[PDB]
Amino acid sequence: NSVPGAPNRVSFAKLREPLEVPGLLDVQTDSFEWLIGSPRWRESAAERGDVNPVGGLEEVLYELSPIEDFSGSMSLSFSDPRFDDVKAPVDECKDKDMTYAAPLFVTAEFINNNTGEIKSQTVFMGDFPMMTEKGTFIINGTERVVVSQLVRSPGVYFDETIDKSTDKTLHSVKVIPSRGAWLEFDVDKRDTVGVRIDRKRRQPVTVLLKALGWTSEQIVERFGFSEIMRSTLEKDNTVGTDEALLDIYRKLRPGEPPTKESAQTLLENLFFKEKRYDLARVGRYKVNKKLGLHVGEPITSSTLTEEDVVATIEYLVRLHEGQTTMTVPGGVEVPVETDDIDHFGNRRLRTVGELIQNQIRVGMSRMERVVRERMTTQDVEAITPQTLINIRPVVAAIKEFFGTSQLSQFMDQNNPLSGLTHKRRLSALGPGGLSRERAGLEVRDVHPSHYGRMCPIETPEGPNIGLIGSLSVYARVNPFGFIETPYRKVVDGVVSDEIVYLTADEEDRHVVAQANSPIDADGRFVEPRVLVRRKAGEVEYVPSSEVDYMDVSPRQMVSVATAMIPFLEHDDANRALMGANMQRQAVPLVRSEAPLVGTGMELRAAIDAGDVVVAEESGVIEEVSADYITVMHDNGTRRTYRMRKFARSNHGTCANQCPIVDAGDRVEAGQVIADGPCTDDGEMALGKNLLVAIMPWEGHNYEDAIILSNRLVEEDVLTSIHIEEHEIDARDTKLGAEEITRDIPNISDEVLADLDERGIVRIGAEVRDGDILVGKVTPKGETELTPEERLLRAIFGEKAREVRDTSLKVPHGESGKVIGIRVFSREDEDELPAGVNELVRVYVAQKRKISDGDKLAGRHGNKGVIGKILPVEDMPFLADGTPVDIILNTHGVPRRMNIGQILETHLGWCAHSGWKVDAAKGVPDWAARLPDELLEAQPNAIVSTPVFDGAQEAELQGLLSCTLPNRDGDVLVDADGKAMLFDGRSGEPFPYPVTVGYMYIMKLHHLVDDKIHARSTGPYSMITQQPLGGKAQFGGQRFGEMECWAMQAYGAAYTLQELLTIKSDDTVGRVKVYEAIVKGENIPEPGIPESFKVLLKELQSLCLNVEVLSS
Amino acid sequence: ALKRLKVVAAFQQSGNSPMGMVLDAVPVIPPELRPMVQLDGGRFATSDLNDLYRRVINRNNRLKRLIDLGAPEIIVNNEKRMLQESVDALFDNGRRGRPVTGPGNRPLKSLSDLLKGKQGRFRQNLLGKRVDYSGRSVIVVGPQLKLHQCGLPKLMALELFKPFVMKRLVDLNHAQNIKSAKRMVERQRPQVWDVL
C-alpha cells in the first residue's frame, strides 16, 4: 500500500517486512546535493554529523585558498561558492540543443598585505551543468548519465605470502594513499624489516627511526619483544640520527651529495608537507580506524605522523610474531590479521559528486598555476581579482569530462526499467581503474561480503562478466563512499525494530541471523538453533543468544530488475542472469497490459523511475486533455502538466504519455496521474499475457524457435512504434555554396509530388525506400567535356548542368509517415559549425508489426526467434474453441533448469480463470499458511508472488484443484494442470493431454530490419581498396582466416582466389567483372591483387632488391 | 669463428657484393601509398612519412650547402651525425636512442611498422578482407525444405543478384537501358520478381 492510487494487487507473502523500500535514486540525488550544498543536504548532514557540515565545492575552495606570492606580501583568497537558478527549462533546453546549466558565483578576495589592502569582488565563474529531477544531465540537447565507480580505498593493507623454499609468512605492509608516495615495511626470508620507500631498497627500520628521532635505545625501550627488529638493529651497521638521515638522502637522491637541508626537506615533503602527499578524509578515517589512533576525533591533519608510522611498524612486527590483538599506546585494542582487497569494506564507491569534485580540482589547479605565475607579471597594488581570474581551464575541464569520458555514458532508455537500472550501476573499469586485460580472475568473482551490497545475479554476459554490476535494493552509500545495509537489532532473543545501518567491517564483527526466522509473534524466537552468517562467510548453527542482527527482509541480496522475476528461487543462476539481462531490452508497445502475475515491486520501480507524471499536491482535477492536466489544488492555485506526445527516445522508440483520470476526481499528493511508455495504471508492464502450450509442434519450433497465431498481428497485440531521425546540412565548398531547392538535376516532376516550396517534404507525406527527403544540389564547378558528350548535348539541346546533386534520401527498407521537420539556419542566429548554413532534421515514424525474425522472450530467459506465424484456424484449441496463441517447445525446459516458467504458467491459468477454495468443512489443509482473501478471487484478477518468499508448490496444486468454470460447467484444465487439445489442422484430438496456461512475454529490440543488409557494389575505402563496412552504408562481410582455412580444406582453389582477388582488391578487374556480367560474357581471368603490389613497393622502398623469377 | 663464418660463407657463395650495408641514395616510396588526401572542409591528412622525408631532405640540403661553403669539421661532422640519425629514424623509428614523435607525442610510424607487428602487410591485410556480393541476416527453422535447399528473403536476394537481373530485364525489354533498369530495380516494380 502507501501509494494512494494503487491497483489492488493481492500478494502471497507470508512475512511482513518492517522497512519499506528507499527512494531508488538517492544514490545520485544525494551525491549531487552533497556536491552543491543543498539546504536539504545541509539539514540532513546536520542531523548526521554536524561537526563539519561542508559541501564539496566549499571544501575544494578551502583547500585551494589562499594563493600568494613567493614573498608572501600579497594574498588571494577564495570563499563562498554560490548558485543562482537555471537559465532555461528542461524540455526547451532539450529541444533547442544546448546544455542544462546554471551560473556559478564565488567571493574571491585579493589582499596586498604589504600594508594591508583588500579588494573583494563577486567573480562570475561559469555555467555549471546540473542534474534534473530524475537524476540525469542534459548535454548538448541529448541526455547523459554518469555511472558510479568502484575503486579501492587508500589506507594500510597488510597481508602475508608464503615462500616455496623457506615457507615463511612474508608479512608486507603497503600504504597506497591518494596523490602521495609509497612506502612498505617488508619481511624477507631473512629476519630483516625493510623500509623500502617507493620502489627502493630494504633499509633497516632504525634508519627511518633515527631520522625521525628514535635512536636504538628508544627502539629497544619501546619494543622489548621485537627480536627480529633488534636483530636488524644489530644488522643495520649504521648509527647516528643525522647519519641515518644523510644515508636516507643519498640512497634516495643519486647525483647529489648528502646535504642536511635537502635531507630534511625531501623527507618533510614526502611525509608531512601536504602538497605532494595527502591521503584523503576516507584514507585518514581508514587508518584511524584500523590502528585505533584517535577515539572520537573527526578528520583533520590529513598528512602522516611518526606516531602512525611507529604504530604501523609495531602492528606489523606483532602480526609476524603471531599476536591476535594489541592495544596501541593511548588507544583501544584492535584485532590483528591480514587484509583482502576484494573485501567490500575496502572498495569504496566514487559516485558522481566525487567524480565531479575531482574534475573541478584538476581544473582549478591548472587555473591557479596560471594565476600564481601571472601575478608576478602584473604590477603591484594596481590589479584586481577580476583581472587575476581565468575560468577558461575550469569550464574546459568540465566540458571535456562530460564529453570524451566513458563514465559519462549515453543515457540508455528503451523503457523505464532500463532507464532506472542504467543508474544504480557500479562499474569497475575506467580512468583511475583497471582495464579489462588487467582484470584478473579474482576480481570478477563473488566475494561473500556482497550479500546486500551488490547483486550477484545481474551482470552483462559478454566479456564484462562481473566487472559491471548493479546495486542491491536496500543499500545506501556512506558519506565516505562505503556501502551500508539495514539490519534489525534483535536484543536477547527479542527482535526490536531499531533498524541499524552497518558496513562490511561491522558485519564481519558481529553475528547475523537469517531473514525468515520463525519469530513468535512478539519478538521471541521459536527454535533454539538458528541459521547464522559468520565473519568468514560461514553458515553455522548458534544458540539464540549470540544473534544480534536479523535481516530486514528476504530478497535483500537482489537487484532491482532481478526483483521482478517471479519464482526466482526455482531457477538456475545462468538463466536468471539472461532473464534479468533481457528484461532491459523490451520495447514500449501501444496497449501495454499489466502482467497477471508478478512481484509487488513493480509499482515502486515505476513511480521512482520518474517517467510517470505524479501529482505533487492533493486536489481535484479541473480539466483533462490528451496533452495537459490542470489539477486544482486545495487553496486557489492551479498547475498544468504538459505531456510529451511521441518524442524520440535515445534508441528510436516512442515516449508517449496519456492521462488516466477524469474531470471530477480527487487526487492526493503522490498519486500516479499519467501513464508513461511501459506503464498501466501506474505499475510496470513490458509485455502481454498470451495463452501458451508446451508441446512440440511439427518441427516449426526446433531448438527453441517460437510459433504464433495470427491474432497477434490482427489485433495489434505486439505492435511497437519506432521513430528514426535523418539529418542533412549545407556547408560552403571551395566552388561556391550549396543550396536547398525544389529544382534539381534532371529528375521528373513525379518525384517532386511531395516536396514543399523550399526543399523538404510536407508533414504527413508517406515515403518509400530511396525517395527524396531534402532537395540539395551542390556547385560542382565546370569540368572538361568529352567530344561524345559534346555531340550528344548538341543533339539533344539541354542545360549544361554545372551543379551536382546531393539529396538526402531515405535508406533501404524504411518507410512510414513524417512527423516533424526541424530546420536550423546560420542566418537564423542558431549555433552551427562553421561553414554550415542550413541544418535540417526529418523524423520518420514507421509502425512496426510483429513478424518472423523478431525476438520474443519470457521473464526467465527463454528467448527465441519467431518461426512461422500460422493462420488462426490451424492452431490448436481447447474444448471451448479458444485457440492458443504461442506454442513453445518441451525439450528446452529440462536441460536448462528453468521450471519457473512452468510454475508461472500454472499460476497464470489459476489467476486468469479465478478460484474459490471450498471452505465447507472449514479450511483445507494446504491453505493454512494462505492468508485471508486469497481463498477466492474473481476471474482475470491479478496476484503477486514476491521473489524469495513466494507461493509454495502445495499451494499451487491446491489452487489448481479449484478453478471455477468459464461459462458452462467446464473445467478445461484438470488437476495436473494439463488440458485436452484438439488439432486445428487435421481435426482429431491429440492423444495425450497437454499443459496450457497464461504466460507473459515481451518483445525484444533486436528486430530483423535493423540487422538485415546486403551489398552488391557500393562505396570503397580510400587508403586501401577494400569495400566499406557497416550497415549504415552498404558494408560487406569480413572473410576471416578461419574461413580461408575452411575453403583450403575443402579444396576449392578458384572460389578462394576469386574471393581474395576480384571481389575485394583488384580495382582494375572489378569493373571488368561488372561489365562481363552485364554484357553476358565469360568472367575474365583475375589479375594481381593490389595488396601484393603495395607490399612489393614497400619492400623495394626498404632497400631490398626484390625480384621475381621466371626461369 | 663459426658465428662469423655463417655470414662469411653466405657472402662467399653469393655473387652479391658486401657493399649493401652502406648507402648513397635512399629510395622514395610513390606518393599514392602516402596519400595527401583532403576532406570536405579544408582539413588535410598525410601518413607521417612525409615528415620524415622532409626532415631527411632538409638535413641533406644543409649538408650539401655546408660542404660547398667550406666549414670546420665540428659543424660538418655534427651535420653528418644528425643526417645519419635521421635516416635511421626513417627506416626504423624507435630502435636506437629515442623514437621521433610529433603532435601528441606519438612516435612516427616508420617504414618497418608497415610490416612489423599486427598492423603490417603480413597480418593485418592477410587475416581477411571484406568482400562484395555479401549479406547476413537472422535464421529461422525451415522444416519443409529439402536438404539441399535454403531460404532467402527477397529484399536481400534482389540486392544480391542485381547485375544479373539488370541484364535479364534488359533482354526482356522491360527497360531499354541499364540506368532505366537500375531505377526500376530501386523502385522495385513488380516485374522484377518474375524476372528474379
Binding site: 624477507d188 631473512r190 631498497r201 630494504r202 | 655534427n78 651525425r81 644528425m82 640519425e85 636512442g97 629515442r98
Partner: peptide
C-alpha cells in the same frame, strides 16, 4: 642488503647508452 645487484647492473647499462644521442 639483499636485492641491489640486478637493479644496479641493469640501471648502469641503461643510463650509459641513452645519454649519448647527439
Amino acid at each position: 642488503e639483499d636485492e641491489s645487484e640486478a637493479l644496479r647492473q641493469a640501471r648502469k647499462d641503461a643510463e650509459l647508452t641513452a645519454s649519448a644521442d647527439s
